[PDB]
Amino acid sequence: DKTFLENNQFTDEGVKVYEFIFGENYISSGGLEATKKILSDIELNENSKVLDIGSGLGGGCMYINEKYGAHTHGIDICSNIVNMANERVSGNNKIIFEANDILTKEFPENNFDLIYSRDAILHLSLENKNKLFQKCYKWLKPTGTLLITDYCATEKENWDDEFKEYVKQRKYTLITVEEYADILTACNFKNVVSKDLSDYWNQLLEVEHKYLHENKEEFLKLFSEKKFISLDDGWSRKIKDSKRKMQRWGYFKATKN
Numbered sequence: 001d002k003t004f005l006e007n008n009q010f011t012d013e014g015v016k017v018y019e020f021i022f023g024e025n026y027i028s029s030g031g032l033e034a035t036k037k038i039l040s041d042i043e044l045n046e047n048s049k050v051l052d053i054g055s056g057l058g059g060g061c062m063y064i065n066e067k068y069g070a071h072t073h074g075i076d077i078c079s080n081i082v083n084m085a086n087e088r089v090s091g092n093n094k095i096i097f098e099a100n101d102i103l104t105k106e107f108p109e110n111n112f113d114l115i116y117s118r119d120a121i122l123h124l125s126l127e128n129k130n131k132l133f134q135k136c137y138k139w140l141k142p143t144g145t146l147l148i149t150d151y152c153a154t155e156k157e158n159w160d161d162e163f164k165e166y167v168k169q170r171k172y173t174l175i176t177v178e179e180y181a182d183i184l185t186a187c188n189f190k191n192v193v194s195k196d197l198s199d200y201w202n203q204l205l206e207v208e209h210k211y212l213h214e215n216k217e218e219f220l221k222l223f224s225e226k227k228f229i230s231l232d233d234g235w236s237r238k239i240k241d242s243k244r245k246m247q248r249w250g251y252f253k254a255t256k257n
């Protein structure tokens, strides 16, 4: 799976294209603005330990460490992206980025105050989503919180041709917001809050889309017209498909006790 992601969706250039539209240090939806919103009700301090699953270019960890002073440990399977993340942080002994497979990584039980993941678990098969959340349950401190956004979808029976092709090409496993919440409940998480944030996601996509159009000249200088068209069309589809709830954006927050 590492090779597949590194050689396709997350080639060096693919990562840089995504960073252009999401914002500096981000490959997750809504970049910095969504990060601020998602963490707006989260309480941590300088003694907190945070795990970021799918840490990408590191913007989320940078923000969490800046806001709270927390120790942040990001894991991402793509070695190239981790290398890029490590280039953007220096002199900070409370931020660590590690290239590894979260499904094989070992952490002590009762270790983290927050386990955070942004638009990363969609790569995992359903079997492996369940396996991951069982691990997360163990790794959380008794007082800890799990906080996730992820790509979700309407039931597969409702998918159209274009959406089927997108999911297939990306090799995503997209489940409903409801099924996702059920996995967390089955893993024994408490106070499971799930929100279908597709409308907010649509707003985020529209801001990103407008930015792309307004900065087309700069994009073409950095990249190419072919890549602009692909990105433009991809965002257009996500805007259309989120409006009609075919492609959805799920938010999940839960606790160990």
Ligand SMILES: C[N+](C)(C)CCOP(=O)(O)O
Binding pocket: 018, 027, 028, 029, 119, 120, 170, 234, 238
């Ligand atoms: C999923 N992601 C937010 C990390 C990257 C963008 O993926 P996609 O919207 O092009 O499928």
